[PDB]
Motif scaffolding. Structure first.
Motif, PDB file in Angstrom:
ATOM      1  N   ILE D  81       1.576  10.568   4.024  1.00  0.00           N
ATOM      2  CA  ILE D  81       1.329  10.099   3.337  1.00  0.00           C
ATOM      3  C   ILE D  81       2.379   8.756   3.549  1.00  0.00           C
ATOM      4  CG2 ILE D  81       0.667   9.120   0.950  1.00  0.00           C
ATOM      5  CD1 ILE D  81       0.013  11.399  -0.284  1.00  0.00           C
ATOM      6  N   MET D  82       2.013   7.684   4.484  1.00  0.00           N
ATOM      7  CA  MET D  82       2.686   6.390   4.712  1.00  0.00           C
ATOM      8  C   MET D  82       2.538   5.801   4.241  1.00  0.00           C
ATOM      9  SD  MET D  82       4.987   8.276   6.663  1.00  0.00           S
ATOM     10  CE  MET D  82       4.096   9.803   6.886  1.00  0.00           C
ATOM     11  N   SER D  83       3.232   5.091   3.726  1.00  0.00           N
ATOM     12  CA  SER D  83       3.121   3.799   2.753  1.00  0.00           C
ATOM     13  C   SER D  83       4.203   2.807   3.323  1.00  0.00           C
ATOM     14  CB  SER D  83       3.725   3.711   1.213  1.00  0.00           C
ATOM     15  OG  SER D  83       3.488   2.799   0.390  1.00  0.00           O
ATOM     16  N   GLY D  84       3.877   1.927   3.877  1.00  0.00           N
ATOM     17  CA  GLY D  84       4.360   0.774   4.409  1.00  0.00           C
ATOM     18  C   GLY D  84       4.985  -0.432   3.801  1.00  0.00           C
ATOM     19  N   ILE D 160      -0.883   8.829  -3.868  1.00  0.00           N
ATOM     20  CA  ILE D 160      -2.347   9.450  -3.203  1.00  0.00           C
ATOM     21  C   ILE D 160      -1.962   8.352  -2.348  1.00  0.00           C
ATOM     22  CG2 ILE D 160      -5.352   8.909  -3.505  1.00  0.00           C
ATOM     23  CD1 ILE D 160      -4.175   9.868  -5.956  1.00  0.00           C
ATOM     24  N   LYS D 161      -2.920   8.689  -0.822  1.00  0.00           N
ATOM     25  CA  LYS D 161      -2.969   7.617   0.848  1.00  0.00           C
ATOM     26  C   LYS D 161      -4.000   7.280   0.497  1.00  0.00           C
ATOM     27  CE  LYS D 161      -1.943   4.829   3.112  1.00  0.00           C
ATOM     28  NZ  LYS D 161      -0.750   3.410   2.257  1.00  0.00           N
ATOM     29  N   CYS D 162      -5.186   5.921   0.648  1.00  0.00           N
ATOM     30  CA  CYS D 162      -6.320   5.828  -0.073  1.00  0.00           C
ATOM     31  C   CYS D 162      -6.891   4.679   1.383  1.00  0.00           C
ATOM     32  CB  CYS D 162      -6.499   5.554  -1.262  1.00  0.00           C
ATOM     33  SG  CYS D 162      -5.759   3.398  -1.753  1.00  0.00           S
ATOM     34  N   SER D 192      -9.941  -0.115  -4.057  1.00  0.00           N
ATOM     35  CA  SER D 192      -9.006   1.544  -3.588  1.00  0.00           C
ATOM     36  C   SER D 192      -7.562   2.304  -4.167  1.00  0.00           C
ATOM     37  CB  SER D 192      -9.142   1.219  -2.203  1.00  0.00           C
ATOM     38  OG  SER D 192      -9.470   2.533  -1.100  1.00  0.00           O
ATOM     39  N   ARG D 193      -6.362   1.204  -4.349  1.00  0.00           N
ATOM     40  CA  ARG D 193      -5.687   1.869  -5.762  1.00  0.00           C
ATOM     41  C   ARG D 193      -5.965   1.801  -6.539  1.00  0.00           C
ATOM     42  NH1 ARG D 193      -2.323  -1.951  -2.096  1.00  0.00           N
ATOM     43  NH2 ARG D 193      -2.625  -3.806  -4.335  1.00  0.00           N
ATOM     44  N   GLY D 194      -6.637   1.135  -6.732  1.00  0.00           N
ATOM     45  CA  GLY D 194      -7.475   1.295  -8.860  1.00  0.00           C
ATOM     46  C   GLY D 194      -8.160   1.976  -9.038  1.00  0.00           C
ATOM     47  N   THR D 230      -0.762   4.811  -5.981  1.00  0.00           N
ATOM     48  CA  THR D 230      -1.837   5.113  -4.843  1.00  0.00           C
ATOM     49  C   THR D 230      -1.069   3.903  -4.015  1.00  0.00           C
ATOM     50  OG1 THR D 230      -2.978   3.205  -6.090  1.00  0.00           O
ATOM     51  CG2 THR D 230      -3.159   6.197  -6.304  1.00  0.00           C
ATOM     52  N   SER D 231      -1.762   3.563  -2.445  1.00  0.00           N
ATOM     53  CA  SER D 231      -1.197   3.541  -1.542  1.00  0.00           C
ATOM     54  C   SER D 231      -2.458   3.093  -0.306  1.00  0.00           C
ATOM     55  CB  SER D 231       0.159   3.881  -0.927  1.00  0.00           C
ATOM     56  OG  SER D 231       0.522   3.302   0.317  1.00  0.00           O
ATOM     57  N   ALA D 232      -3.083   2.150  -0.762  1.00  0.00           N
ATOM     58  CA  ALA D 232      -3.726   2.067   0.806  1.00  0.00           C
ATOM     59  C   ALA D 232      -3.121   2.222   2.423  1.00  0.00           C
ATOM     60  CB  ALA D 232      -5.024   0.923  -0.101  1.00  0.00           C
ATOM     61  N   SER D 342       6.798   1.711  -3.539  1.00  0.00           N
ATOM     62  CA  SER D 342       5.265   1.108  -3.366  1.00  0.00           C
ATOM     63  C   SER D 342       4.343  -0.060  -4.279  1.00  0.00           C
ATOM     64  CB  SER D 342       4.255   2.055  -3.190  1.00  0.00           C
ATOM     65  OG  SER D 342       2.849   2.105  -3.266  1.00  0.00           O
ATOM     66  N   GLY D 343       3.389  -0.834  -3.746  1.00  0.00           N
ATOM     67  CA  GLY D 343       3.253  -2.233  -4.465  1.00  0.00           C
ATOM     68  C   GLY D 343       1.929  -1.630  -4.588  1.00  0.00           C
ATOM     69  N   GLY D 344       1.911  -2.588  -5.847  1.00  0.00           N
ATOM     70  CA  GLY D 344      -0.051  -2.784  -6.470  1.00  0.00           C
ATOM     71  C   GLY D 344      -0.367  -1.868  -7.264  1.00  0.00           C
TER      72      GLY D 344
HETATM   73  O1  LIG Z   1      -1.090  -0.294  -0.990  1.00  0.00           O
HETATM   74  C1  LIG Z   1      -0.510  -0.007  -0.490  1.00  0.00           C
HETATM   75  C2  LIG Z   1       0.929  -0.596  -1.623  1.00  0.00           C
HETATM   76  C3  LIG Z   1       1.994  -0.235  -0.516  1.00  0.00           C
HETATM   77  O2  LIG Z   1       3.311  -0.372  -0.484  1.00  0.00           O
HETATM   78  N1  LIG Z   1       2.330  -0.060   0.990  1.00  0.00           N
HETATM   79  C4  LIG Z   1       0.781   0.786   1.695  1.00  0.00           C
HETATM   80  O3  LIG Z   1       0.898   0.968   3.023  1.00  0.00           O
HETATM   81  N2  LIG Z   1      -0.220  -0.101   1.434  1.00  0.00           N
END
Ligand SMILES: O=C1CC(=O)NC(=O)N1
Ligand SMILES: O=C1CC(=O)NC(=O)N1
Ligand SMILES: O=C1CC(=O)NC(=O)N1
Ligand SMILES: [Ca+2]
Ligand SMILES: [Ca+2]
Ligand SMILES: [Ca+2]
Ligand SMILES: [Ca+2]
Ligand SMILES: [Cl-]
Ligand SMILES: [Cl-]
Ligand code: NA
Lengths: 363, 360, 362, 362
Positions: D81-84, D160-162, D192-194, D230-232, D342-344
């Motif tokens: 799960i890589m959250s940018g 979660i990665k989505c 997707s996050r929601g 969650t993170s897309a 993580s955002g959103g």
């Molecule tokens: O939906 C997201 C949120 C986040 O913080 N980073 C991501 O790569 N995707």
């Protein structure tokens, strides 16, 4: 007696720069009481949070009010101020000033440049992007045509509109009154306002029959479009301001306008066709250009002639900014001059991924 | 006897190798004969663009498993030049150069040569050391190309390094200063010094005019065929010389011109003409178009101001790439062409070289 | 005896004068007593931020109408310092300084005092160099006199607006045979901010003159002012100076205190500045009039040994990120994101930190 | 009995595996026991962020080489799960989850437990709709079982990665005669996050199935999970789930606790989460392994009544700004910006807030 339209394309050093207009007034070339419209390219981002639009209008209204000895509010009631933000790529900030003289001369032979201006009523937020905006724009377009003394809609070559957008506060006002808005997003509301306004042009000019236009069709049926509409959204006003530009049999202008439609963002052939339609038939005659005015956009397919691009996927740079940079560059490469008017977001303005392009030229 | 084939392959993402895989699996490309891959990757093309390394790693992985060798040996054999930044309508793609030795029976035809330089110290970036060493490898690559006359060289593509925070700290530790502190500006210095290395080797400019003080200051000095692009993922220069040789049996040729400014469509048409394309009907013979773009230091184009150098939201190399790609695309009817930004000492100030590879 | 009143006013847009007009129309502000307005405007805070000029033009036109004088006369009389960039949760607002003459008893300890001075216009080749340093230093001394502050230890915040370079101004310099301090419009903001900040340090005695030279500007980060807060913009060609401190000749119901953030997450320094302004507990946060702070990316690329990308991010300039970060930190301490945070703290506090001041009711 | 170990590792770039390799070479990590890696990578965290896939590819390639197996096998065994988005001062890093069965005693109370589960691939037209909600819920329940957690109150964070929609995927859906939930690549990340977050709330009994429909997704902000994060990303077509809690069947020397930030500047919630993880004073913060939090712009465009421009800014997307803000707030409380934000936060905590968890040494 007789209408004579003069058009001045003026480079600007900043959104608030009125010095080039002041030079033309001080030399006697422009009577400021004869200005009917100013169309600007201002160097903000051309999207939601672009305050160069309002800064430019305020600066021009202040200046003209002082020169005319009237209030700023009277200037804004009298003169169309249409500021299109976004001067990406090599696009040069500038204003185009439309002057309508009343002269003691006969009409020139044939048809020559004519301009008409009309303002709609203010719109409630729940009307943006919907039939109310379409039908009221259509009515105002017909009014501006009569102002221009243009009888044949085929003699209209460019209809430039400033239109409103939805802010958080305006959406909440609609909600408090029990109404929903076409979309709960300021940026997307710009597309709906641009698109509804463009369909109003198409309705008024008979480019589309009325029974093909409905709320459901706005920003969905891309087969519906005007070939001359050019619309641009901003936060400053709540109505639409319309400039109709065409050719009239009752004009003493030394200018004409012609147009074509870019089928896509790299359609240089359409640039040359618009020049030819304005009487410019060779490269050496390109010194007769007064301005070129065009709409640009990212095609919904995410491609150009089958080639992928990232405009719709690029989260760092909004796609309307990229579209403006590209079409300005294409036009500049044909005419040799990047100081041309390009506006982004071409909903129902030419086909999906394309847009109208008009040329004002000396005869 | 050398023959050169060139394949322009659209990509769906930085890591997409499927188009290359299709041509290998169909026998149309023998992976052992690949000598260079020139890519446009869809990152921002500036400092924090990781699509360059992502693309190189994905290609190195793939070619290693297909050649049975290690990733590290692949990067020593094949030049990977990934230029980030696909702004406007510019389409992400890779250009694969194949060089096969085929005995066969006049006329000058496409020839290509590769040459890596030694690794540079950070204190050597943007300075005469980089210039002189690049000039060496260019002549080395001219040799591998079997090209004797530099007038037969039409494009010299280079991947060059940049200065990172740690590479500055290294020169700091070692007791030596660097050419500039800004990592973004080191890209311009590395690009410009490398370009001067091409002009020096090809005899485009004499050596007594080149000094450290001239680098990124004297725009009267420039190559007309050099095309340099910086990235973080290496510390040497990788050079591809492309031109025409009598000792070549390629079904392709390369021509070129120089864009005087960012909207110079006349130079695009001249480059096409120099490569044997004389009408719009013959456009389908294009293999690829390759050009340098940049913002003019004057802040203007043909007397008209633009905001590229004043725009704090969008880096000027991104805008220049969008503009020049749109201009080329409007001439050839195809936005899938190579445009790279920052043309320091590559064509005049505000312009850059443009080359066309075409079928004969 | 001078009395200073300070009004922190939310704004809906750069040109929004409605909140100020409400205070004037209610009788709370005599517009003739306004001496300075310090704004946060919602442009990008970098080179091509025109919200700063739009805000100044709107305020000057409004005040000119209210006062029956020309706009030119208003801008000669009132300092207008508009700091762009309202990133993160930072709330756009203006802080209006009103100064009136009053007959009142003396010895209220020391209370808030404000002074204003302007420099001459600068040629583009003077930005970031000793001419800017020395002119600013003279103006800072004049503003101190205007504030009736003789002791530099009673100065707690010196807010400056200063010019920057555009491509067009660099070309004007070239045509006249002159070289500018840096050929990058964004970096020109750092040199103008830094030279202006060293001018504060020179005037206040924080750094001796013999330590300041062109070569030190934006290079020797151990040279800095602990109270200077400088902000650059395309909309002016001179420096405007607001000196804020406490004096014994003041009848204000307010005081100012300050500290210095050692880095961008130094919440301790926020609490130290509150305490220096007399706010000794969370229960007393309601006495805040505004918090004013400088933020920046450290040249090391790190915060407490941890890497960040602020200096490497080609999509978002580092002063935008520094403003979002420091505003969020302050907001989390005081419970309110409507505070003044300006980015780029060259010679303003140590490398990676910046001064922070609090204006508070006593 | 399961023992969980967790290693927070700073990274120099998205492809940097050196900190992990150090821990493997010294014998502190058995690579065969890695069950998940949660990353912050320094791309823009939005649609066109390829640092996420670049990081996953480098980690899968390295681990496959270490375990003598294929890349394909690693990605089927280990959750990546890589959250940018590492805006502001947020430090790029990875958090490596190691889990092994052990023969050991109990119960020392409840200690850290982790479980993993993957969903099927989703069609573009299923994102942001009930197909995604229900399938995520199924997988969360599976991951709870893998973690040996039977009480949802013992779940403190569900990461979660989505997937998301690109222009090409939207166009393809259109060609197949199918419309997607939103015709906007950036906004598709929110749906997707929601939908994934609502899947968590459904699985855990936080909200009744009765209340969830397509129409409520990204519309009824009264519906939310207090532990979903969650993170897309563009680099996958399914959802990958990490359940983190505590259970009686754990031999780890770690625990997790959590709270919920009511808004982006809720430092009190940061301290509450610390307390819930056993960290009772500033002196005990050296026990932090990591802090993990969701951040977002409130739909009202305000924080505590104060306007901000996050939803208006066409130059910088609001998830980038939200991450910078909340990371800065957390960093100012714990003194360390190398934490996961993580955002959103759609249906993750209330509108404008989000969950925050702390993993700590006992
Ligand atoms: O939906 C997201 C949120 C986040 O913080 N980073 C991501 O790569 N995707
Ligand atoms: O190009 C454009 C389109 C629009 O809608 N509004 C602007 O300010 N510029
Ligand atoms: O266009 C360019 C120039 C460069 O130096 N580096 C890139 O990645 N792209
Ligand atoms: Ca269109
Ligand atoms: Ca050049
Ligand atoms: Ca500092
Ligand atoms: Ca939430
Ligand atoms: Cl005359
Ligand atoms: Cl401004
Ligand atoms: Na104004």
């Amino acid at each position: 007696h007789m209408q004579k339209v003069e058009v001045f394309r003026i480079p600007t050093a900043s959104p608030d720069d009125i010095s080039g207009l002041a030079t033309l007034i001080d030399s006697g070339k422009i009577n400021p009481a004869e200005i009917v419209a100013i169309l600007g390219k201002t160097e903000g981002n051309g999207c939601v949070n672009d305050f160069t639009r309002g800064f430019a209008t305020q600066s021009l209204a202040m200046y003209l009010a002082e020169k005319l000895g009237i209030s700023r509010e009277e200037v804004v009631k009298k003169v169309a101020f249409i500021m299109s933000g976004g001067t990406e790529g090599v696009m040069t900030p500038h204003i185009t000033v439309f002057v309508r003289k009343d002269v003691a001369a006969p009409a020139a032979p044939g048809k020559r440049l004519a301009v008409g201006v009309a303002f709609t009523r203010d719109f409630l937020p729940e009307e943006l992007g919907r039939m109310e905006q379409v039908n009221e724009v259509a009515r105002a377009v017909k009014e501006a045509m009569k102002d221009a003394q243009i009888d044949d809609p085929r003699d209209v070559h460019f209809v430039q509109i400033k239109c409103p957008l939805l802010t958080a506060e305006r959406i909440e006002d609609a909600k408090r009154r029990g109404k929903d808005v076409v979309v709960n997003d300021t940026y997307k509301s710009m597309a709906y306002s641009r698109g509804a306004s463009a369909l109003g042009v198409a309705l008024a000019l008979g480019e589309i029959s009325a029974d093909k236009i409905s709320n459901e069709a706005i920003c969905h049926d891309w087969n519906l479009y005007s070939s001359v509409a050019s619309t641009s959204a901003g936060v400053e006003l709540l109505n639409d301001e319309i400039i109709v530009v065409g050719n009239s049999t009752n004009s003493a202008s030394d200018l004409v306008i012609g147009h074509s439609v870019m089928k896509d963002a790299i359609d240089a052939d359409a640039v040359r066709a618009a020049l030819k339609d304005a009487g410019i038939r060779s490269d050496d005659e390109m010194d007769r250009i007064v301005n070129v005015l065009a709409k640009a956009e990212a095609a919904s397919s995410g491609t150009v002639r089958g080639r992928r691009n990232t405009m719709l996927d690029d989260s760092d740079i909004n796609h309307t900014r990229s579209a403006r940079a590209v079409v300005n560059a294409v036009i500049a490469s044909v005419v040799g001059d990047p100081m041309v008017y390009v506006s982004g977001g071409a909903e129902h303005q030419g086909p999906d991924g394309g847009g109208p392009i008009a040329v004002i030229a000396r005869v």
